[PDB]
Enzyme design. Structure first.
Site, PDB file in Angstrom:
ATOM      1  N   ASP A  86     -15.329  76.521 -25.254  1.00 15.40           N
ATOM      2  CA  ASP A  86     -14.634  76.262 -24.006  1.00 15.40           C
ATOM      3  C   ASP A  86     -14.602  77.566 -23.213  1.00 15.40           C
ATOM      4  O   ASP A  86     -15.062  78.622 -23.694  1.00 15.40           O
ATOM      5  CB  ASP A  86     -13.248  75.694 -24.255  1.00 15.40           C
ATOM      6  CG  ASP A  86     -12.344  76.555 -25.106  1.00 15.40           C
ATOM      7  OD1 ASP A  86     -12.574  77.783 -25.168  1.00 15.40           O
ATOM      8  OD2 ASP A  86     -11.385  76.028 -25.733  1.00 15.40           O
ATOM      9  N   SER A  87     -14.091  77.529 -21.988  1.00 18.52           N
ATOM     10  CA  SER A  87     -14.200  78.728 -21.161  1.00 18.52           C
ATOM     11  C   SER A  87     -13.068  79.743 -21.355  1.00 18.52           C
ATOM     12  O   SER A  87     -13.219  80.877 -20.867  1.00 18.52           O
ATOM     13  CB  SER A  87     -14.225  78.313 -19.698  1.00 18.52           C
ATOM     14  OG  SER A  87     -12.993  77.773 -19.301  1.00 18.52           O
ATOM     15  N   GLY A  88     -11.995  79.350 -22.018  1.00 16.40           N
ATOM     16  CA  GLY A  88     -10.822  80.159 -22.275  1.00 16.40           C
ATOM     17  C   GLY A  88      -9.657  79.938 -21.353  1.00 16.40           C
ATOM     18  O   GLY A  88      -8.497  80.333 -21.498  1.00 16.40           O
ATOM     19  N   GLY A  89      -9.859  79.261 -20.246  1.00 13.10           N
ATOM     20  CA  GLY A  89      -8.972  79.113 -19.111  1.00 13.10           C
ATOM     21  C   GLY A  89      -7.796  78.224 -19.440  1.00 13.10           C
ATOM     22  O   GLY A  89      -6.702  78.446 -18.945  1.00 13.10           O
ATOM     23  N   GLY A 105      -8.926  67.648 -17.068  1.00 10.22           N
ATOM     24  CA  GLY A 105      -7.669  67.337 -16.428  1.00 10.22           C
ATOM     25  C   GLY A 105      -6.901  66.148 -16.939  1.00 10.22           C
ATOM     26  O   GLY A 105      -5.858  65.805 -16.376  1.00 10.22           O
ATOM     27  N   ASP A 128     -13.375  66.358 -28.493  1.00 13.52           N
ATOM     28  CA  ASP A 128     -12.798  67.385 -29.328  1.00 13.52           C
ATOM     29  C   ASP A 128     -11.296  67.182 -29.385  1.00 13.52           C
ATOM     30  O   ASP A 128     -10.700  66.693 -28.430  1.00 13.52           O
ATOM     31  CB  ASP A 128     -13.031  68.813 -28.846  1.00 13.52           C
ATOM     32  CG  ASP A 128     -12.196  69.186 -27.629  1.00 13.52           C
ATOM     33  OD1 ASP A 128     -12.596  68.859 -26.482  1.00 13.52           O
ATOM     34  OD2 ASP A 128     -11.123  69.813 -27.786  1.00 13.52           O
ATOM     35  N   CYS A 152     -12.348  54.933 -47.110  1.00 18.17           N
ATOM     36  CA  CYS A 152     -12.865  56.248 -46.768  1.00 18.17           C
ATOM     37  C   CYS A 152     -13.794  56.776 -47.867  1.00 18.17           C
ATOM     38  O   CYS A 152     -13.454  56.730 -49.062  1.00 18.17           O
ATOM     39  CB  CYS A 152     -11.720  57.248 -46.544  1.00 18.17           C
ATOM     40  SG  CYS A 152     -12.300  58.920 -46.118  1.00 18.17           S
ATOM     41  N   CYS A 186     -14.810  59.869 -48.062  1.00 19.11           N
ATOM     42  CA  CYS A 186     -14.696  61.332 -48.234  1.00 19.11           C
ATOM     43  C   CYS A 186     -14.398  61.782 -49.647  1.00 19.11           C
ATOM     44  O   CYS A 186     -13.890  61.050 -50.503  1.00 19.11           O
ATOM     45  CB  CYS A 186     -13.662  61.804 -47.202  1.00 19.11           C
ATOM     46  SG  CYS A 186     -11.984  62.084 -47.850  1.00 19.11           S
ATOM     47  N   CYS A 213     -10.790  61.262 -50.946  1.00 18.23           N
ATOM     48  CA  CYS A 213     -10.426  59.896 -51.312  1.00 18.23           C
ATOM     49  C   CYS A 213     -11.115  59.481 -52.595  1.00 18.23           C
ATOM     50  O   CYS A 213     -10.637  58.597 -53.301  1.00 18.23           O
ATOM     51  CB  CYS A 213     -10.722  58.968 -50.143  1.00 18.23           C
ATOM     52  SG  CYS A 213      -9.502  59.258 -48.817  1.00 18.23           S
ATOM     53  N   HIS A 223     -10.030  65.220 -45.277  1.00 16.44           N
ATOM     54  CA  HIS A 223      -9.954  63.758 -45.130  1.00 16.44           C
ATOM     55  C   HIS A 223      -9.938  63.378 -43.653  1.00 16.44           C
ATOM     56  O   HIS A 223     -10.700  62.495 -43.243  1.00 16.44           O
ATOM     57  CB  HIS A 223      -8.750  63.147 -45.865  1.00 16.44           C
ATOM     58  CG  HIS A 223      -8.515  61.746 -45.362  1.00 16.44           C
ATOM     59  ND1 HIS A 223      -9.290  60.678 -45.755  1.00 16.44           N
ATOM     60  CD2 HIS A 223      -7.606  61.244 -44.495  1.00 16.44           C
ATOM     61  CE1 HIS A 223      -8.857  59.596 -45.146  1.00 16.44           C
ATOM     62  NE2 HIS A 223      -7.830  59.890 -44.352  1.00 16.44           N
TER      63      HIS A 223
HETATM   64 ZN   LIG Z   1     -10.797  60.262 -47.179  1.00 17.81          ZN
END
Ligand SMILES: [Zn+2]
Ligand SMILES: [Zn+2]
Lengths: 367, 367
Positions: B92-95, B214, B264, B302, B304, B307, B333
């Site tokens: 990102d630009s930091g702003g 915005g 994000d 899930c 992952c 899990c 997770h």
């Molecule tokens: Zn999971």
């Protein structure tokens, strides 16, 4: 595998290298045990702890009985299943942390959680059963340092009475006696005759292994070594010798030179999250400004995943920033370092060059 | 691979699925970007972030320029090398963080670190260069919510002037222009005509992708969706559409239904360390007593690693105890959950059943 078998494959002076076979796996000795406090080796997944080379971890009974609770862990399938570590676990009896973190009598101790609680030889062994511990420590009484001869004697005596009670509690629980091992703890402060009396009493009760209790409590390395010098030979030679709570690398080296086969300590984990990293040229504190643009690994020879992938500069940044990844990487490195230390010790004993290793290790580490 | 190529493979109404090809790798769209704040996705190694399915991460320029510093990271080889992530990084630009965490003018902003600092279109782009960012965000001016039409207009105008300056700074740096991409940000608060003016201005300057800036600033989902309804079609159809800072799962689903390709948000990481776990039946707070003896995984479907190996009861314990492993597991997770969400969205669009997916997803998630 058997419930418990300790075999010595090689010796050099008082040092030994070998293996403990247990149902959940083989432990290479001399062994270093990462400390799992409250059912976690801090900041590491169990797979990571194993990847570093650990064969066994320690669990703190005092912390577990407070949170999440012994009975609860048993309900849930025991500690190994709960935390995801399926290799051996050594549990301490809970008594140390009682005195340092939490009413004393011949029966045991009552105390309030840092909730009122109780421990005794019987309850201690029971809690370690509930956790599913592979190596059970007898419940003893802490002997402060320094202690007068009188008090050291009284407490050692109590601890031997408690050792018999531990033995009997353990043996009366068939599941525990058939699948776990029980270690006794030698007491007597710095006094040779009390250490001998204690050794004798423990040997007469008979245990699978023998710990040297009561050291690394403020006496300093010279005194610790002097006590080990006479105390370890008093223990049965054909069983493991465990030095509780001893973990600086030079302490470990000198303790192995004196007959110790097993160690635990929170320094690598603890010191890691705080910024201290172990290296073959001595510890460094990665927060020091000198590391802010150092692209080298924590240690130049270390084979750990951390040293293969990240720089001092990055870890420096993470720890300064209070990032969890900094704790993760520092801890993985330090435990890996300790395991490589143990491997070099094992190999050098097996090759009859341990004396030379200890020399080379010190000249460089304290350079 | 090229510097930048976006191809749409499939569509359903306003939703799109496809790929962005960049030198450091391919990004599957719609995409979710884990947030690397200060050169770390909190509590996860980069290999773990990748294992969850992430193709790209976000880096926060404001935090990096404060610690460890842009110039320093460049000295050290750039952000990818420093942190161990070799796939694309969006910076990102930091702003934004300037206004929320840290003197404003047409030139830019000066501010004091939460040390005096400065950002402007030029310095922002420069810092993102120093970091080695693959996707560079133009520097804009934050438009608070709510904003009056007058102020929204003035600020949008400034932001379009700053967009041109960003474009020119970026293009004047040959290394950056040849290897990175530049995204412009649409402003105008909730006002259709300003959003159109902004879209037009950005398209005339020309960017590799277009963010809707915005939103997710307090207006709530109904208003956010209403603004997206008219704002996204104003953007060039053949470039990526990025909705900054939007991350609840239902927000993501509805935003994709309206033409957004990239997201994000710190919720999965942030919410994870705090105890919130995402599930297909809705979020849970693992600290709740109801989970203390629940042997089920965080989520029943899930895939992952968390899990597959640990229970709710264990993670409950860890988070209650303030253990780092609790943060590690919760975060892994939640990011994995988000990536499986993005995969289900991609697949359903590719199969022309995204409308049905959104329906099924909501009926169950809000059951
Ligand atoms: Zn999971
Ligand atoms: Zn290392």
């Amino acid at each position: 595998r058997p419930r418990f078998s300790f075999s010595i494959a090689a010796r050099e002076g008082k040092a030994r290298t070998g293996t403990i076979e247990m149902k959940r796996g083989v432990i290479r000795t001399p062994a270093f045990m990462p400390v799992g406090t409250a059912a976690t080796v801090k900041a590491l997944k169990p797979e990571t702890v194993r990847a570093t080379g650990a064969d066994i971890i320690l669990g703190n009974t005092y912390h577990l009985m407070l949170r999440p609770g012994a009975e609860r862990i048993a309900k849930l399938g025991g500690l190994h299943s709960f935390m995801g570590w399926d290799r051996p676990i050594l549990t301490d009896s809970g008594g140390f942390q009682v005195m340092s973190l939490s009413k004393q009598s011949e029966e045991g101790v009552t105390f309030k959680s840092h909730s009122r609680h109780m421990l005794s030889p019987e309850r201690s062994i029971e809690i370690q059963h509930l956790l599913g511990s592979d190596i059970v420590m007898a419940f003893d009484e802490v002997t402060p340092y320094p202690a007068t001869p009188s008090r050291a004697a009284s407490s050692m005596e109590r601890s031997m009475r408690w050792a018999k009670r531990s033995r009997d509690a353990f043996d009366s629980r068939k599941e525990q006696a058939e699948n776990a091992a029980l270690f006794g703890i030698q007491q007597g402060s710095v006094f040779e005759n009390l250490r001998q009396q204690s050794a004798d009493a423990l040997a007469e009760i008979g245990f699978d292994g023998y710990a040297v209790g009561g050291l690394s409590g403020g006496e300093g390395q010279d005194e610790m070594f002097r006590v080990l010098d006479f105390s370890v030979p008093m223990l049965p030679d054909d069983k493991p010798h465990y030095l509780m709570g001893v973990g600086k690398p030079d302490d470990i080296v000198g303790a192995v030179e004196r007959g110790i086969d097993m160690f635990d300590c929170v320094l690598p984990t603890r010191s890691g999250r705080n910024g201290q990293a172990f290296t073959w040229d001595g510890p460094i504190n990665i927060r020091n400004a000198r590391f802010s643009e150092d692209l080298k690994p924590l240690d130049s020879e270390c084979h750990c995943a951390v040293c293969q992938k990240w720089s001092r500069a990055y870890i420096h940044h993470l720890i300064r920033a209070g990032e969890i990844l900094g704790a993760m990487l520092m801890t993985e490195h330090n435990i890996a370092f300790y395991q490589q230390l143990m491997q070099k010790i094992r190999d050098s004993i097996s090759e009859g060059r341990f004396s030379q290793f200890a020399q080379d290790f010190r000249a460089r580490y304290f350079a």
